[PDB]
Symmetry: C5
Amino acid sequence: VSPPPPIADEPLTVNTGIYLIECYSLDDKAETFKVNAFLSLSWKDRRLAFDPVRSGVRVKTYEPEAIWIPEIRFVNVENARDADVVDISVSPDGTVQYLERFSARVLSPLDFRRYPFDSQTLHIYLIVRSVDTRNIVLAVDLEKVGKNDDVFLTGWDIESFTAVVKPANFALEDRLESKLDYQLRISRQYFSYIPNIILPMLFILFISWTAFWSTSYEANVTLVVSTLIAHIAFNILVETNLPKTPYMTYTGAIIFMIYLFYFVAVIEVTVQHYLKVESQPARAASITRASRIAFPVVFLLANIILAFLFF
Amino acid sequence: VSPPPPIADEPLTVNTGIYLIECYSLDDKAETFKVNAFLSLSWKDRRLAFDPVRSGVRVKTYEPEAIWIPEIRFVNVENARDADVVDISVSPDGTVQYLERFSARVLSPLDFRRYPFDSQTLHIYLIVRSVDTRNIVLAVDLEKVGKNDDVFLTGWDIESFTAVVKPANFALEDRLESKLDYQLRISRQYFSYIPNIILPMLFILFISWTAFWSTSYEANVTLVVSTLIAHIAFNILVETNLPKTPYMTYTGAIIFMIYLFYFVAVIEVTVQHYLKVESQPARAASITRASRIAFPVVFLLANIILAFLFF
Amino acid sequence: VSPPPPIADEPLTVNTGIYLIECYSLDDKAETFKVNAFLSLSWKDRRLAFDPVRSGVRVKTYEPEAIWIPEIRFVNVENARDADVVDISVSPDGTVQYLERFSARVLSPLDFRRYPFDSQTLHIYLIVRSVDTRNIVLAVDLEKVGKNDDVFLTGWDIESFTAVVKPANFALEDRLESKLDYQLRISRQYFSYIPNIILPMLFILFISWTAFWSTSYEANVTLVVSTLIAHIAFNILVETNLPKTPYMTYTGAIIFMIYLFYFVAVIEVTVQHYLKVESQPARAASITRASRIAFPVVFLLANIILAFLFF
Amino acid sequence: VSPPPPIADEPLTVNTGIYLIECYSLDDKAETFKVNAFLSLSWKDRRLAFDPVRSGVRVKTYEPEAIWIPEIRFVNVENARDADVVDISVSPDGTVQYLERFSARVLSPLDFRRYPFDSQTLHIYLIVRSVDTRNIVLAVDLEKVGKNDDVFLTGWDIESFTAVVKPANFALEDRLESKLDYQLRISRQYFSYIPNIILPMLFILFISWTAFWSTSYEANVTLVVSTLIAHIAFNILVETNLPKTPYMTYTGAIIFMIYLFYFVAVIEVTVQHYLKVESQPARAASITRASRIAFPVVFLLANIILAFLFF
Amino acid sequence: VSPPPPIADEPLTVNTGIYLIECYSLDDKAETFKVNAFLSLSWKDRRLAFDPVRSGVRVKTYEPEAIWIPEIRFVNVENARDADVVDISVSPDGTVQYLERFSARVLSPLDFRRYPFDSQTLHIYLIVRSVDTRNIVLAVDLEKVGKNDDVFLTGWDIESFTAVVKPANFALEDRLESKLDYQLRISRQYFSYIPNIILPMLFILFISWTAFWSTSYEANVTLVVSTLIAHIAFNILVETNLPKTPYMTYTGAIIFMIYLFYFVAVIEVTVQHYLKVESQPARAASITRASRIAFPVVFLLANIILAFLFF
Ligand SMILES: O=C(O)/C=C/C(=O)O
Ligand SMILES: O=C(O)/C=C/C(=O)O
Ligand SMILES: O=C(O)/C=C/C(=O)O
Ligand SMILES: O=C(O)/C=C/C(=O)O
Ligand SMILES: O=C(O)/C=C/C(=O)O
Ligand SMILES: [Cl-]
Ligand SMILES: [Cl-]
Ligand SMILES: [Cl-]
Ligand SMILES: [Cl-]
Ligand SMILES: [Cl-]
Ligand SMILES: [Cl-]
Ligand SMILES: [Cl-]
Ligand SMILES: [Cl-]
Ligand SMILES: [Cl-]
Ligand SMILES: [Cl-]
Ligand SMILES: [Cl-]
Ligand SMILES: [Cl-]
Ligand code: NA
Ligand code: NA
Ligand code: NA
Ligand code: NA
Ligand code: NA
Ligand code: NA
């Protein structure tokens, strides 16, 4: 078993296809996803040609060991795919039709900038390394690229699964490599975040703003310090569900900005008390009255500016 | 070893059966469950036929390699099942009786809408891909479909395990596929949720309502802010045990609604203090007296409306 | 290699023995434990018999493939045991002495009702499926059932390891199955729970009761609300270490009941303040004085009633 | 391939050696550690003897299958070691020199009594089961026992890796076994615990003692209840990093004792307020003045007594 | 298959190269990283030489079994690498060109002293053990050492991947070993830590300092005790993301020092109250006024001293 010889000097074309069966375990922190799919391969090996008159069968079936099979790998995998060959069917001209079902943990990076209103392009890169005897090139058989309707990725919407038909042919360590880009387009189901994180977080912030209708320093301290603690709890929760990015994320920006609002409300509460104690409640009263409008107005504008910057 | 040839042009019928031994590790977040079961297969291979009078033996035992065995797979699995053949028995007419014991991690989605008073239909999809020589169709031998009494799924009640007898026959990548639906019906043991989550949560909410029988702003602030923190703790706990759904769950809606009750009680406590300070405790007194009834009444009605919507 | 033929019509008896080497990873939430043990098997194969005189040897050693070995499995396992054959020794009368060392993750359910003062009977079910040629029955060789002194299960006391000598014969999928019950008796090391959970929990409850020697509503609110929060922390901690049971556990009952004590102390604290403000401190004083005795007395009695119900 | 025959009736001596390459993943809760080491074996097989004069060769290299190799196992492992043979070299006298590199997860119990100032003796027990033909005894070749400089166990200091040269020979299931004790001596790097757990815990306790210089019941309640909550947080953190022991640990004793100090300070704070309200601030003042000395003095003595008991 | 014989007495040179494909799962606590790379090996086997004229081919492809291949291992791995041979090619002179794609979990220690502004040198140690027949020495083919552009390590910047060209040859168990150091230089993406941990932590500390503009003991106690609790929350979060080091880390030291600031502010708040109650608010006033400057000034200087010591 060695590669099929060329009729001229042409490279050997391996037609490929990936059909997704199961898509699961999309880890945001790890920037990985698990995939269970069909991998279909097709090439001509004239040495396998037969007469069905003589052989008695129109199509021959071979075991992987019996014939030459191209060493196909995935670029962006943790470990080599766990594959089980489904069928190897040889037609009288020497055309080999290979099918396997595999499972792999794919490493494809994610862009969390718009999180949790973000979309991703997951990649599955198919590769073949050319042999000394002859050069191997990958092709996309669009008829054999797809996914079933059952394919469900928890907390995501699956938009598309397509292949970039033109392979990336390049030199690596004195040999040729033919790379294929299978792109799985997905968009996050942002719903859950609103009642689970966003609105709870806004409610505690608004609770802190009731200190602007209070003259009790002891109560105001309790209000603004306690809501701040509840915010720290949400911040920790959020940062446990996300990786450490070298950029700011949308949720991250909002969460951070709210700390500034808590900080300024502590300043306001302090200023109001100091003046009241210094026997000038008229100044304290005018600051507190301004705060009642300024805090929500600045909050609303800051958020518009933020949303504008991110989307 | 190749598929048994057809007498006419009829497809080859593979009679199937799944007998559950162990059912375990139902992960709600992952929407997966682990299974340890018997898989029984049966088909007629006329080439394996023999005379019961001439052979002496009425049954012959073969090793997997010795005979043709259909390539049977599960659709909704993480990885291919870990199988170990128990027995292969051939009758004189050439009817093969295959038995294996397997273990697999099954991906079957869950409906959390009524959580924790929800029921699920777990699926195990058996599939066969037809060969070039002849078409393979799956069948259900009801006599070989079951589960043992010992089958225990922690925190669940196992209702039924049945097969949808009519296979889903369809074309995939120019070959026929025969799919079978094995449905495992289960209902959640909601008991634990009442003393662990529901009642603790209601007790803290009721503790917050004691502020309606208090004139002390500083104490009321402490009461409503502290119970709010305790509620956040239960909300986080609950959302760690569940996946992020693009819909509202029952527990989710109740938890969210209680935030609104905390928010309004903070408004009430603030309003009562402001009036008292504005030297109008008569208005404050009538609002607080109304709150005493309104808060429980609106809580009880909102909950009835919620339960009606979910059930 | 086929089963040994019967002299009459008697079933083939396979004498068994499990000798525990390592017992570890008892997961309460998963209701699983890991095991590492010797499995010893013994049966008569007349076909393997020899004369020690002409042969020169009194014992013959064979490789697993060379002779017929019964397909022995465990019922309550996650996946099939990882086994390594240690020795296969044949005596002149054809008596085969098999030994393997295996490791398996066993699913055996637990009764948490008396937790953490509970005891369990872990099970390891050995099974053999009868063949068409002849029926296979299991037996217990008590001389080969045991465990070493080193066998340590973290946080548990190992009481016994015995086998239910009479196998349970039954039909499963038109074949006879011979099942053996190996019972590993263990009792929980409840020590840790006292300084880690029980006493911390009682101390915070007793701290809440100091409000019965205080006339300060603001301080009482702080006391009872804060200790309640600390109780919620212990409740969550406990429920993370345990599975969700469709019944009440001992610790669960105690933990739940303490919620009610906190609720009533909030009512008492509220009632005392209201009366004091309504200018009737004499009534408030008599209620508070009663509470000082009633709270500990009712607590002590409720606990006696609880302990009585559970033990 | 069968065992080498004895010249007399002497047992076969297998000289052993373990050379640690990697020591990692010491799990305190699991009482396990992972290892990566060389296992060296040596025994005389007279059947493999040759003439170095005629053979021209001083050494002959064989593949594992070609020669008899003793079945060596580890007692205290989770699963059987993952091994890969490095070399098999035979000398003219028939002395076999075996070398493999293995990796195993070892179960060796730990003594937490002095935690985190504790030391441990990890064990690796090598074992051989004697065959019917002849008895096998293990030996230690001290020249082939060691570890490299690079061997780093995170948060531990590696003291010594030695073997107990005299094997423990005993009968198990009618056959002889020869056991060897490889002891890995390690001591915990206690540094981290001081700024991470111990000092934070002492600082909160000392903050609670500032209530002895305060007449404000409301403030004292806040001080002692809040520091108590922060102490519960450290207790939970500590008990998550440790297994549940049927004995008291050093850190556990200290952590438990500090609860009693918090409990008594709540009593003191309560007593001081009650007296002040009962219009006897002179008694309250003398109790508070005593508390200022008594609390630190009793704390310091209790700790000396504790440290004395544990070390 | 035995090692190629030496022309003189020279050692056999194995030219090596590692080309990184995937770099992932850098665990700080475990001090491990996962790698997926090409391993290229090259050595002269004169026995494998041929005439390209006679044979007609200028390259010869062999299967691993067909020829002698050096037993190459990694020193700092958990378990032996999962490898799959890509190609084996022989040139007329007998120069073998081996290529495999492997995946391994590498244990390489990290220096947390400057965390999270730290840089690391990850190591991959290639090793070969000399045989009895001849000595094997490793070499670096710089032409075959590299990494692709796609190589992304989450939360890290990949600086370089180079090999220390001169092997560290040494004796281990009377045999020579040739070791190669492949160094992967990386620097931490410290960005995230600033909005996530550093600034939240500074904001709560600054909130505590508002007590220096307050005469209310009850409010000051609430402020400094609450912010202390929020600080403990960040400390625990940080220490969960890091291993226990026998040295102080940068973040660790800052976090520790902030406890001292909280402790002294509690002393200040206590002192101010005591004096006020002792009817000397003039002394209390001058201490509080000094604190307003002293706390930020000492904080800023202590941090300069710290940063100076660490960088
Ligand atoms: O035969 C299979 O494995 C899968 C079929 C499918 O997803 O339709
Ligand atoms: O023989 C078995 O593997 C299983 C039997 C059972 O579940 O009864
Ligand atoms: O594996 C063995 O030979 C022995 C184990 C034991 O005695 O526990
Ligand atoms: O050859 C090896 O596998 C290891 C060598 C070492 O630790 O020195
Ligand atoms: O052929 C490969 O396995 C890898 C290629 C790559 O990383 O470019
Ligand atoms: Cl392939
Ligand atoms: Cl792959
Ligand atoms: Cl099959
Ligand atoms: Cl499958
Ligand atoms: Cl077996
Ligand atoms: Cl098994
Ligand atoms: Cl071995
Ligand atoms: Cl082993
Ligand atoms: Cl190799
Ligand atoms: Cl390796
Ligand atoms: Cl040397
Ligand atoms: Cl050498
Ligand atoms: Na092939
Ligand atoms: Na077959
Ligand atoms: Na308060
Ligand atoms: Na056999
Ligand atoms: Na061998
Ligand atoms: Na080889």
